[PDB]
Amino acid sequence: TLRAAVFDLDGVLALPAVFGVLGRTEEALALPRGLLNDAFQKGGPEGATTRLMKGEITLSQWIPLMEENCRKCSETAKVCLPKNFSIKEIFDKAISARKINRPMLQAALMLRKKGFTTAILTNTWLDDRAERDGLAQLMCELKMHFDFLIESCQVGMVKPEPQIYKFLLDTLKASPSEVVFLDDIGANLKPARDLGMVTILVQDTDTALKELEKVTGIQLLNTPAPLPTSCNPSDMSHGYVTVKPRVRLHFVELGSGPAVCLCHGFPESWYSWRYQIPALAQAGYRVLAMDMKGYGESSAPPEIEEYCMEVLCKEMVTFLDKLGLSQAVFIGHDWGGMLVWYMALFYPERVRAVASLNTPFIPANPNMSPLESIKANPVFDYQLYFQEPGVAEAELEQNLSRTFKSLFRASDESVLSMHKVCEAGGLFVNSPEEPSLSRMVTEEEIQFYVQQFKKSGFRGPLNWYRNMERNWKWACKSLGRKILIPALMVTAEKDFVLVPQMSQHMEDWIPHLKRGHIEDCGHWTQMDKPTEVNQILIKWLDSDARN
Amino acid sequence: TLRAAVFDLDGVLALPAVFGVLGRTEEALALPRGLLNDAFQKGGPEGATTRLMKGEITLSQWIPLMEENCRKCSETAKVCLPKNFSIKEIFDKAISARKINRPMLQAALMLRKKGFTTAILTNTWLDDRAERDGLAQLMCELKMHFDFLIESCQVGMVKPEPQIYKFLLDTLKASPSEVVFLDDIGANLKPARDLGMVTILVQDTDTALKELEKVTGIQLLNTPAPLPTSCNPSDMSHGYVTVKPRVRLHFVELGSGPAVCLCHGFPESWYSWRYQIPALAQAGYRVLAMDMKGYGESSAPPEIEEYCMEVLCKEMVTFLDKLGLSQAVFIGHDWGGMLVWYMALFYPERVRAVASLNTPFIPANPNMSPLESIKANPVFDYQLYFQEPGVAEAELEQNLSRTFKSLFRASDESVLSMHKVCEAGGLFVNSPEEPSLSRMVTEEEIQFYVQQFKKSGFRGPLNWYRNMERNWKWACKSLGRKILIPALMVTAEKDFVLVPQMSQHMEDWIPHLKRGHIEDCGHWTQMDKPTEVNQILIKWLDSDARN
Ligand SMILES: O=C(O)CCCNC(=O)NC1CCCCC1
Ligand SMILES: O=C(O)CCCNC(=O)NC1CCCCC1
Ligand SMILES: [Mg+2]
Ligand SMILES: [Mg+2]
């Protein structure tokens, strides 16, 4: 029966309720009970606060008016107000103190994930305070999680006025019968209840969620920790920068703050950071998730040398140049990780900080040739299979869906053996024709990769493996250097190709290297342990890259 | 004969020369003359500094080595070094003290503008200091103005080694004969002189430029103040955000720092800010130059209501939402200016600061209808001509080149009479079929507008004028508000349509409104007085929008 849930902001999606700062201030100030509240509702429908809530005047215009009210209220009450009594001071602190009620938001998200039309109905104001950004960021984060956001000051109506509930119903495209409305102010529930829609008087969150869980018949409480926010491609800002006549790089951008450049591995895409893009943006950074040369909407020239590390890094430098960025924090995974270590070794000036997931920084061996070194590692056999131009391309391109379903698997869902590849004569030789769906990815996400790779195939992507000799000679130019800028290395316990122990010596080249380690995490780190990754990166960014 | 000019960095394009900080430190510290310098060149080709300059070790690795050298040099000299002697301290201050020698850069720019192949040849290091960003930003600004940047630490070679000069010649694709090289270190000039290329020992800039002017036969000194940097479309990062199913907004982005959203007028484009995009980016901001709905690469739906101010503003809010931006400074011109005032009146929370060029904020008249108000102003007659769907479209689209050449004109190049439009039955009725080229724009720039408008024509752009009634009713909702966030209003003396006096009352709605006024400046403000505009905006941004 129910199809939509509407949540109030103050006291429901955000706490502590700003409206509740009036009472707390009275006790603290030994003022008569309810004094500040009376001054707040002085005049009712025709009072300053209602005009404020309807958008007739701004918050800064309202402040002086609320002040006179407090005086007039203390006058009939025969009481004085402290000398440093400041309404601006009072609300500034209350507003900034108000945080998102995560469990309430989580419940909204769940209901929405299960087909519910969600909305926010709140009496609010046009905030033009010097500190408005705080409220802006909070609304910015909530907004994306709901189908609709109905703000009183925006629609000229305010609860309890029944007209706004009709507006709600019309916006929702649902009859009262199929709508549950949560509010902490009983008065606001009556109008909704009269229309016949379900209502929940929200005092304490748990109780409120128990009623909500009961009435909707969906688990909302004591539910498992959910996956972080994953962005939708069509809702992202897409950027394109031509770094060379035939080479254009594509990236998705979100957030403000220090620039953080994400560099995916093989055979992935910017979408491989879908879980950290919103998280890092949310943490105060300007995220630039790349489509590395050879992938997605980025150019994919056929020439092998177009993908040697030196060229790839120059291009990323040019990328910063064209965007007018003197630096960016570089965070890479797999092949992208190799690239950031080198960005730091050859262009320290442009790297604010560097971080790699799984991919350890290993210096070139002045003596042993790349081919030799690689043959000395059974698990790296597959890299030899990628050498001959065209072969690997045919196998990986034959059935894209199969390709990504076979590759993108958790540590214990494996179906491939990177060690017996050349021997087997292929990468999927003894792999299912129709692999099951990895717990890490949905059928939709798999198809996103599928469509991205239909554009350029695996030639460009595979070419990254075809410059061993060139990359070796280039890297040798840096054997005398050291990475002295902030650096983070995150190892993945169950990554059987890029094993943790491979990074054990890194300290010799990065003295102040900081670390991170994720257990029971395979090679596809971002997808596997998104929550751990975000927490590790954000912690690191806030302490070493933000300064 | 000459075809290329190569400039050294330290002492030529940047001053004061960092290399010259060694001597100044010796005097200040009463140390033996040349002591610090000796420690700097200790070992010659095999010394620490040469390895540093060749990219073998990083600057931070070099510091400790330079320290030991200073000790060893003071030992043979039988002298001690102050207790708080710090090489890091010394170079940090020197490096950050080093600024771009504007007159030298200006000369390079001129030569390049006249067909010269320009380049930078400098012995430098991989800077991994905690303060590297300073040098990064300086190189970031210089880089774009030259065809090539040859850094010693990047090519493993260093002056005076003749091999690097051959590398230079090869990179330049020019024989010695047609190359002039400027350096402040005589030793570095000999190798070049031996190959036969012209050389200039640069002590003082003026003298150096006199020699350069003489040898190239081009005015480089005492030359007029040049136009600020104007960006090239193909070198910009292009962003696209879908704000609604059928509406995608395009923008050009440059720089880092607070977000600054530029909103052009009618009938323009993001390219109308070509002169301020680099300037504002350079001043420490992240510039987002929009293609306003209905223009360039932004969507242009046919429906008239798709362009009423309320919808246009909601879309810009969504634009910020999708980009993960809680706020942006909004700077608009002409119709874009009208839009920012309203962004500030209805979404103060999202506007960090607001600024308008030419377009004054005028509140709706509760009594007089829009049509009536507009008819009461002879100069606004043209707005009536734009009402009938299709008419204005035909005239403006008939000959695009003519359209923009006729419109984009300085205060004293006018050929149109906005006042007798309806009477004349057209906008170009008594205008040249082949207007001359305005001093404000080149034939190329005119063609850029031409190609942009070939995509959607003037329907969408003209639709901005077709929502008077709707915009009026919407604006009436704000008659009780005031703009209390930082606001800037820049009037243009010779703008005969958006006249300065039209903004005289603005203070009544924006008490703390700051102002700016550009003399002998027409309607096309950005194009007309780019230098004045940049200076006025940057000054305002740094004091009111940066905080
Ligand atoms: O998940 C899998 O089974 C294989 C993934 C393929 N990854 C790489 O080839 N990484 C290289 C990055 C650069 C250093 C060498 C390994
Ligand atoms: O340069 C010229 O001759 C005409 C330029 C056309 N500009 C406008 O129509 N501006 C409107 C902005 C919104 C307020 C009314 C004027
Ligand atoms: Mg409430
Ligand atoms: Mg020099």
Q: Identify the sign of the CA torsion B137, B138, B141, B142.
A: negative
Question: What letter does residue B173 receive in the DSSP assignment?
Answer: T
Nearest CA in chain A to B547: A130
Residue identifier of the C-alpha nearest atom 10 of ligand 2? B334
- Report which ligand 1 atom has the smallest distance to the Cα of A498: 16
Q: Which of A497, A523, A528 to mutate to test the pocket of ligand 1 (most atoms within 8 A of CB)?
A: A497
CB B319 within 8 A of CB A235: no
Judged on CB neighbours under 10 Å (0-12, 13-18, 19+), A373 is middle
CB B127 within 8 A of CB B55: no
Dihedral angle over CA of B200, B203, B208, B209, nearest 10: 140
Say yes or no for a CB contact (<8 Å) between B253 and A144.
Answer: no
Q: How many residues does chain B have?
A: 547
> What's the CA gap between B409 and B379, in Å, rounded?
17
CA of A316 to the centre of ligand 3 (A): 49
> What's the CA gap between A161 and A138, in Å, rounded?
26
CATH of A17-96, one of 1.10.150.240, 1.10.1670.40, 1.20.1440.230, 1.10.569.10: 1.10.150.240
Q: What is the 3-state secondary structure (H, E, C) of B76-124?
A: HCCCCCCCCCCHHHHHHHHHHHCEECHHHHHHHHHHHHCCCEEEEEECC
Our answer to whether residue A465 is catalytic in this structure is yes
Q: How many residues does chain A have?
A: 547
> What's the CA gap between B176 and B165, in Å, rounded?
9
Smallest Cβ–Cβ distance between A326 and the set B126, B133, B240 belongs to B133
CA of A374 to the centre of ligand 2 (A): 67
Instruction: With CA atoms as reference, report the closest residue to A274 among A414, A441, A109.
Output: A441
Smallest Cβ–Cβ distance between B323 and the set A132, A237, A485 belongs to A237
Dihedral angle over CA of B97, B98, B102, B104, nearest 10: 150
Say yes or no for a CB contact (<8 Å) between A281 and B324.
Answer: yes
Our answer to whether residue A419 is catalytic in this structure is no
Judged on CB neighbours under 10 Å (0-12, 13-18, 19+), A450 is middle
CB A135 within 8 A of CB A128: no
Whether B1-16+97-217 and B17-96 share one fold: the answer is no
CA of B486 to the centre of ligand 2 (A): 24
How many CA atoms within 13 Å lie on the side-chain side of A344? 28
User: Which positions of B are annotated as active-site residues?
Assistant: 334, 465, 523
Instruction: With CA atoms as reference, report the closest residue to B523 among B440, B447, B452.
Output: B440
* Count of beta carbons in the 10 Å neighbourhood of residue A47: 17
| Residue matched to tokens 């009210």 | A69
Dihedral angle over CA of A295, A299, A302, A304, nearest 10: -70
Superfamily of domain A1-16+97-217: HAD superfamily/HAD-like (3.40.50.1000)
Task: Please calculate the CA angle B206-B212-B217 and round it to the nearest 5 degrees.
Answer: 120
How many CA atoms within 13 Å lie on the side-chain side of B434? 0
Rounded to the nearest 5°, which phi and psi values hold at B148? Answer: -145, 150
> What's the CA gap between A296 and B348, in Å, rounded?
38
Catalytic residue among A183, A334, A495, A544: A334
**Would you call B155 an interface residue with chain A, using a CB distance cutoff of 8 Å?**
no
The ranges assigned to domains in chain A are 1-16+97-217, 17-96, 236-547
> What's the CA gap between A529 and A534, in Å, rounded?
9
Dihedral angle over CA of A94, A96, A99, A100, nearest 10: 110
Our answer to whether residue A385 is catalytic in this structure is no
3-state secondary structure at position A400: helix
| Residue matched to tokens 């170009």 | B428
* Count of beta carbons in the 10 Å neighbourhood of residue A235: 15
Dihedral angle over CA of B49, B55, B61, B62, nearest 10: 10
A-chain residues near B256 (CB < 8 A) = 259, 286, 324-326
Q: What is the 3-state secondary structure (H, E, C) of A273-339?
A: HCCHHHHHHHCCCEEEEEECCCCCCCCCCCCHHHHCHHHHHHHHHHHHHHHCCCCEEEEEECHHHHH
Residues 44-63 of B with CB under 8 A from A: 51, 55-58, 60-61
Rounded to the nearest 5°, which phi and psi values hold at A4? Answer: -140, 145
β-pair type (A328-333, A351-357): parallel
3-state secondary structure at position A249: strand
| Residue matched to tokens 């995220």 | A287
Nearest CA in chain A to B153: A346
B-chain residues near A242 (CB < 8 A) = 234-235
- Which of A122, A128, A250, A320 is the best substitution to test chain B (most B C-beta atoms within 10 A)? A128
- Report which ligand 1 atom has the smallest distance to the Cα of A523: 1
Task: Output the six-digit token pair for B543.
Answer: 């004091």
CB B348 within 8 A of CB B313: no
Superfamily of domain B236-547: Alpha/Beta hydrolase fold, catalytic domain (3.40.50.1820)
Say yes or no for a CB contact (<8 Å) between A238 and B236.
Answer: no
CA of B415 to the centre of ligand 2 (A): 16
CA of A94 to the centre of ligand 3 (A): 14
Nearest CA in chain B to A325: B255
Dihedral angle over CA of B29, B30, B36, B37, nearest 10: 130
* Count of beta carbons in the 10 Å neighbourhood of residue B143: 14
For ligand 2, whether the C-beta of B359 sits within 6 Å is yes
Ligand 1 pocket residues where CB is under 6 Å:
A 266, 334-335, 338, 359, 407, 416, 418, 497-498, 523
